[model samples]
Target: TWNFHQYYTNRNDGLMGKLVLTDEEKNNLKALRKIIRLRTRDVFEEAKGIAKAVKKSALTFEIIQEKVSTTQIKHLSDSEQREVAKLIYEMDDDARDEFLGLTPRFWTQGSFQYDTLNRPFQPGQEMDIDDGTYMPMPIIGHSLLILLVDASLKSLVAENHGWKFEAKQTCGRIKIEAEKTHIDVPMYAIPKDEFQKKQIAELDSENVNLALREGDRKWINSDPKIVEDWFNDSCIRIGKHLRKVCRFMKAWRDAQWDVGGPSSISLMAATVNILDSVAHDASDLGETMKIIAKHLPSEFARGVESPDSTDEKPLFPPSYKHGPREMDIMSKLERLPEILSSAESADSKSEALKKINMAFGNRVTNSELIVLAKA
Candidate 1:
């Protein structure tokens, strides 16, 4: 059966968040997974950071797929690599088998080996692994790479859906009228501009510093528990509000016809991408709040403030591009709800996914497109 939440709620995370499969589900899951991995690699290359790893780890797909892949099994002996490959060869179904066979010998994770020059892979050097075939960058794990590809697919899907949703929601036409930049008119309907600005101000405050200083003040004599609660409540409100906005944005993504319905890889990819962006955005927002704490009242600007505070940092960056520099997730997401909304965002996201489908679909050489595509 399909998950009821996928039909409504966008609060998916932890166990509630994942690609669900049914008996009727097609064999495309493998192909989709491979596509996700490939796209994630491209995203990481563009971002030049490990954020993709953080996003995937948050989605929990990093852990879920580990058991399914030969990459997780480590080796003490030379044969261990081959042993793992044998398992993948035996356990996988036709789709997995066919896909695995299509993969180049050097690209197989099971074939990866660890070597060294001046230092061997021990303790600190564990990160850099070099072998005859593959060089394992220590900080960049297979899981990270896998998630990056997956995240990109999600971002692409969201962009396509986001544009179309904008086009129809605003101009009531399949095509968008001029005068729209990124986000269209429907976003303005949520009162986001004013509310977000206010929220941003609250986040910018240095609550931690104020709380500690206020506690020590002779005249104020603030309750320690009250101060703690205030900070906690503020943190929760910030998180909740951010999530609420992200949820709505995701709902907007789902509303598009390009979503290909719930339970599909396109839907899962969109959900995963949005969830990743939301989680990352919330963290960045928290960092922004800490910065805000410093510029606020002297009492509030204690521990909650950022350390490099020269009182020079802008209250907020002029734009997302100014803030998060990464390209993988934020690049696609920043453009969607922030710059383009309504039917416009939906149309773009849908169109992008259509192109992505064509590209991945064309890669199939086995049992037709569905024969290679999977969860």
Candidate 2:
């Protein structure tokens, strides 16, 4: 017997137009449906949101995909290393005195290493990378240690035309004007006798595993790889969906504010905490934004607690990036959840896309909203 009630067919006439099946076709259809259900149960699919949403309204899925695509910014064409390595080589040859003529070595950290790096979302926001410069413990002439490194970077920036340098409090920034990219070089110093304590004859850059950042003439006990490692572990345990959510949150931040909202790492921490409850397989991108909109404001208003928290404090302390302007961010988010709710419950494609375009900066094309067709 044909059970028309078991499935749905949307047509001009009624619920059941016709879905006749041969004995062989019906048997094959059952097998195919069984396999699809099992695949849908897969917990590891990184495209969980997309795959699930596609089964519902494909137009809604397109709007979500377009919004995500809008967040993606352009990246530089050249290899990320070629120029930085040129400067690093120049830097390696410079420091040699006062304490075994120590030359610093490098290891990467931050968003780039964490694989959450998105291209500049807004104009004038350059592609960025962080490479930590680690040297054996040195405090030559008080500020001279980091100052010497800064001077080296400055000199190299001068030698290389089209390169710009800045000696920020914690890092040396090298901006490649041509490439629209900048690489941040943070200064870290391994504690004294670390090589001796570890029983190594030579100072290896790989030992950056124990490097502490130099800030305000004090050694801040920060590991270069702690956040990177923890983020990687989260992706492994929770599925790559964890990273995609982080990326989406970052994109949302970039889309929401012109500048100076939450840091990428801060957003990542919040995403990890939020994922503990919101399973991605059955959710849409709008749901992700709605949840973040609800929670992040409170989290930032107070303080951001991270898996990367050190012995003394949470990731963002009270006096850190959290500020009154976060009220502005939440104000923008209020519009966000409202728009998503309107679109998600909209009666027509044009109505939904128009609402979404308002929310995500018109990434959805005019053609995407077409609700009527002609013969």
Candidate 3:
């Protein structure tokens, strides 16, 4: 029902490695990277003066030097990296913390390196470039927070870059709307000791906002990195077939229009749970997906006392099982096995593609269907 070879690049998605880029896009990204570097220098110079004049702790020149030293193209030799690391290691805690809070995290993380897929662009059509960066601004009583709010770094960005900032009230995620693309900068006030764990556990609202209701508030303890790590490890344990299946399921999800559909992470976790128990032939994804579909209903039923009953903890992630989303997925799973089985045994490629597409709520297009069938 799917072909991982043609459409799927070995490049994985998310904050790690992601989307393939064209030569023009790559050049643009480099230019953007240069702009950010210059802007950071400007901000650093301004911040140091302000901090000194205001009788506050300076963000430190060493911090800025570290940023400059550490940043470079991949062509940098091992000696260069070692020298850069040597300079950064000399910086004290205060300088590191303040600089971190102010500096754009995306620049360091290479968030601008990836771009979402474009519908095959024709020469006659206007050039439509889709790209963005996700920057996390950690504001834990650091000098950068003061620089933004009191010292007017926010206004500086608007005036110079033609970017508008939309700030979130509680979460502090600021959306920076620029000419070419928008950058999402999430603010966190995590403690130094708790940084690694919290970083690993972070989840943005656009994806998993699964929160537990307490009196008048809601709290979400999302550990996506832990889950992601498990999935990768499990893929290795099970074989590469699991990753291929995952990508297909994700693509299927992307194709459909179900407002109440499950999250990609949720789908991954559920699939992992299913495959852990039941072993299937690695070559046949149709059969594997069918097995997964067959198991989902039972998994949903776990922790339920009766057809009408519910439990405090369910087989599905607590966040996912709360409402119609759970029932919706379960209902779809009921018929998916049969559809996939039919697709597997179908005489014609068209017939098989139709059945698979039907199971995915007609999300697969004619061209994609053809690709999948031939593959």
Give per-model CA RMSD. Answer: 25.6, 20.8, 12.5
Error of 2 at 201 (Å): 13
Model 3, 4-107: lDDT tens per residue?
Answer: 23223233321012223456766764564455445444545454443332234444544544443333311224454344333334445665455444443222
Model 3 regions more than 4 Å off = 1-49, 56-183, 189-224, 258-260, 303-322, 360-375
How do these models rank on lDDT, best leading?
2, 3, 1
Leading candidate by TM-score: 2
Could you give me the TM-score of model 2 versus the true structure? 0.60
lDDT of each: 0.26, 0.50, 0.43
Question: Per-prediction TM-score, please?
Answer: 0.17, 0.60, 0.51
What is the C-alpha lDDT profile of model 2 across 279-319, one tens digit per residue? 54412334555565566655655666767446366655453
Clash count of each predicted structure: 61, 2, 0
Q: Model 2, 181: alpha-carbon shift in Å?
A: 1.4
- The clash number for model 2 is 2
